[PDB]
Symmetry: C2
Subunit: 211 residues, 2 copies
């Protein structure tokens, strides 16, 4: 967003009539909302299989949809990913689903398998899904992270003058480094959708050209 540029002592030089940034924020909201529905639906599917169908062509029963919507809302309004996944786990135990435990030395701990996937390797994920440990049978709730996109912005710095250009919003000018730095950190980073919801490092690369 560029609502705050003038508040931080900058000027908007150009504003795109159709903000591809606003489209990106709607995409983030969509993918976030759809995670809630996916998590809630998988929880309901797991509870249904371990206790006999949730299906009505190509739709869930209305009572399943109402219950999925309820859990999804609660899931969404839980803060951290840790609290969200704890809320779904509590719901599953309330429905009589029993989480597996494993021994690590003498101690009982949750039978969760954490790991990594990539474009070219899902071997560890596949083994975690297929493993039933001591038993012949198991239900799994599988959380997977999706690839984020790539974005390019540009800047011209001339002494204390900073021109910042985001093809998703437009062009802004700040008359000092400090005014640009405060605006970028305190206004733009969150409001833009580039910050994300989770903690975690993402790469950046700056290529420098002569002015």
């Amino acid at each position: 967003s560029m609502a705050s540029v003038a508040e931080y002592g900058g000027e908007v030089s150009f504003k795109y009539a159709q903000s591809k940034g606003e489209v990106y924020k709607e995409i983030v909201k969509h993918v976030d909302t759809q995670h809630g529905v996916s998590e809630s639906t998988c929880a309901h599917w797991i509870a249904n299989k371990v206790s006999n169908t949730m299906y009505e062509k190509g739709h869930l029963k209305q009572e399943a949809i109402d219950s999925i919507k309820k859990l999804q809302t609660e899931f969404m309004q839980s803060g951290s990913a840790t609290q969200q996944f704890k809320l779904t786990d509590n719901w599953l135990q309330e429905q009589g689903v029993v989480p597996k435990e494993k021994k690590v030395g003498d101690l009982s701990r949750r039978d969760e398998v954490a790991g990594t996937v990539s474009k070219s390797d899902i071997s560890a994920l596949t083994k975690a899904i297929l493993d039933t440990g001591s038993d012949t049978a198991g239900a799994k709730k599988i959380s997977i992270n999706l690839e984020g996109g790539s974005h390019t912005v540009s800047a011209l710095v001339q002494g204390e003058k900073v021109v910042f250009f985001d093809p998703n919003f437009g062009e802004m000018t700040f008359p000092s480094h400090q005014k640009f730095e405060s605006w970028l950190k305190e206004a733009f980073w969150e409001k833009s959708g580039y910050a994300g919801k989770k903690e975690g490092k993402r790469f950046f690369n700056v290529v420098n050209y002569h002015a």
Copy 2:
């Protein structure tokens, strides 16, 4: 919930009439294409600012009489470069292509020199929800000089997805709320289908290299 399930000896038990997975694949296409447009537009903006003959007005990319739009000539040229960028395949070759275009337009990449040797003045690092201090320094740093132009690549947060499974001996039931329910009569048939068919066709695989987190929670059947 595709035709690939039966090809790998499985059965579709349920198919969502409205696939949230198909919507997700359209989103991936959009965000990928929009990287092309963002890269090409930033390249043009950099060439315009560095070429500039004093005042901005003399050679703006902005349409004078149409508020909040680029000139049609700038749009056509941006679409040309974006196409070339898109056809490159390999992020290394894509960025090399943009760099060649920038030099063709008279833009001069900065070098770090030690004795007789050069390398590109490019600064990598990391950002997060709560820290962009290293990014901010890389943008503001002009090295030797008081002036410089920057093309800034930022990686975005991917979303999260949940799927589920039930394994009973050799029977694998896999459920993706974005597609539906599939059943495989052996582990082998599930593993081959997941790795060779589903992972790419789902949109979950991605285009770039990069490790992404998964978590499997096990419940008694």
